[PDB]
Design an enzyme around this catalytic site. Structure first.
Site, mmCIF file in Angstrom:
data_model
loop_
_atom_site.group_PDB
_atom_site.id
_atom_site.type_symbol
_atom_site.label_atom_id
_atom_site.label_comp_id
_atom_site.label_asym_id
_atom_site.label_seq_id
_atom_site.Cartn_x
_atom_site.Cartn_y
_atom_site.Cartn_z
ATOM 1 N N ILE A 71 -21.441 21.853 -4.095
ATOM 2 C CA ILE A 71 -22.850 22.157 -4.239
ATOM 3 C C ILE A 71 -23.419 21.293 -5.358
ATOM 4 C CG2 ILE A 71 -24.336 23.991 -5.277
ATOM 5 C CD1 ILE A 71 -22.628 26.063 -3.767
ATOM 6 N N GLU A 160 -15.979 27.649 -0.431
ATOM 7 C CA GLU A 160 -14.525 27.871 -0.355
ATOM 8 C C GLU A 160 -14.131 28.610 0.951
ATOM 9 O OE1 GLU A 160 -12.816 26.075 -2.210
ATOM 10 O OE2 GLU A 160 -13.400 26.093 -4.291
ATOM 11 N N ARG A 163 -14.022 26.212 3.632
ATOM 12 C CA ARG A 163 -12.754 25.437 3.660
ATOM 13 C C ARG A 163 -11.551 26.191 4.189
ATOM 14 N NH1 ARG A 163 -14.157 23.682 -2.369
ATOM 15 N NH2 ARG A 163 -15.486 21.791 -2.024
HETATM 16 O O1 LIG Z 1 -14.950 20.064 -8.577
HETATM 17 C C1 LIG Z 1 -14.706 21.356 -8.004
HETATM 18 C C2 LIG Z 1 -15.594 21.729 -6.811
HETATM 19 O O2 LIG Z 1 -16.925 21.958 -7.274
HETATM 20 C C3 LIG Z 1 -15.010 23.040 -6.243
HETATM 21 O O3 LIG Z 1 -15.343 23.299 -4.884
HETATM 22 C C4 LIG Z 1 -15.488 24.133 -7.200
HETATM 23 O O4 LIG Z 1 -15.146 23.818 -8.553
HETATM 24 C C5 LIG Z 1 -14.880 22.459 -9.053
HETATM 25 O O5 LIG Z 1 -13.768 22.386 -9.946
#
Ligand SMILES: O[C@@H]1[C@H](O)[C@H](O)CO[C@H]1O
Ligand SMILES: *[C@@H]1O[C@H](CO)[C@@H](O[C@@H]2O[C@H](CO)[C@@H](O)[C@H](O)[C@H]2NC(C)=O)[C@H](O)[C@H]1NC(C)=O
Length: 246
Positions: A71, A160, A163
């Site tokens: 995001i 998440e 995913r």
């Molecule tokens: O860089 C990553 C991405 O943003 C992940 O999806 C959420 O947290 C962070 O550490």
């Protein structure tokens, strides 16, 4: 764009949203039947807009980079908000340009900086559909410390879950009662780039990871994933980060 409404939400409508979110992400190939996100997308098409409505019908629009499900920022009424990081500054050249003002949050979007801003690790922040309603509400008005915890809930319950089918299911289990993420959920989040890479390296290597990925399972036990036949690869992961971005 894709949308999700908390008013009347249930596991079914949340699952419809996560399905729309996955299906909005472009891909040209699958690797072991899992969609492979693109190396790159130029201009505005890089960003998906997610319209989220809290139980009262108030809304924010969240911009998500379609190559990595990260995001970048969000619009709430007439103000845009972006993480303090170059990919987000780039996104602000394409999305929410009609906002009357733009605030750069005082942190980047990664979990370590967000948890520092929030004052707590995400092991200790409950997630679920009610937490997501709270998160949308929080983001409607600027408060940078409150927003960092809202954003930790938003990232887990949208990106998440897109995913990992296990994380989508965890949130469906929390449709009407929030609970902190299982240790397995945190493990999967922390492993998405590693899993995405090893699944791609396994093409060329007879389905075998060049380097084993360690995960926590549903019972709290640490396990080694060494090849594609693992349930994490066959049933759980839904999107691969392209190795060009790793
Ligand atoms: O860089 C990553 C991405 O943003 C992940 O999806 C959420 O947290 C962070 O550490
Ligand atoms: C590929 O992965 C599977 C696990 O998904 C491996 O098989 C497991 O590992 C050991 C036995 O060697 C046991 O602890 C598990 O119970 C096995 N599970 C199953 C379902 O077979 C397998 O050894 C791996 N293969 C390669 C070539 O690395």
């Amino acid at each position: 764009d894709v949308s999700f409404r908390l008013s009347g939400a249930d596991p079914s409508s949340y699952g419809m949203f996560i399905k729309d979110l996955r299906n909005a992400l472009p891909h040209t190939e699958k690797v072991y039947n899992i969609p492979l996100l693109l190396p790159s997308v130029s201009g505005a098409g890089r960003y998906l807009l997610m319209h989220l409505f809290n139980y009262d019908g108030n809304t924010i629009t969240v911009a998500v980079d379609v190559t990595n499900v990260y995001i970048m920022g969000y619009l709430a009424l007439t103000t845009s908000y972006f993480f303090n990081e170059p990919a987000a500054d780039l996104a602000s050249q394409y999305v929410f340009r009609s906002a009357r003002r733009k605030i750069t949050l005082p942190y980047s979007g990664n979990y370590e900086r967000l948890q520092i801003a929030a004052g707590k690790p995400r092991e200790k922040i409950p997630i679920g559909l009610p937490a997501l309603d709270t998160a949308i509400s929080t983001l409607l008005h600027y408060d940078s410390t409150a927003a960092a915890g809202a954003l930790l809930v938003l990232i887990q319950t949208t990106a998440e879950a897109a995913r990992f089918k296990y994380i989508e299911q965890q949130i469906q289990e929390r449709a009407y009662r929030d609970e902190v993420p299982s240790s397995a959920t945190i493990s999967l989040e922390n492993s998405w780039s590693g899993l995405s890479k090893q699944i791609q390296l396994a093409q060329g290597n007879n389905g075998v990871f060049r380097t084993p990925t360690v995960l926590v399972d549903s019972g709290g036990n640490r396990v080694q994933i060494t090849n594609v036949t693992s349930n994490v690869v066959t049933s759980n992961i839904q999107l691969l980060l392209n190795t060009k971005n790793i």
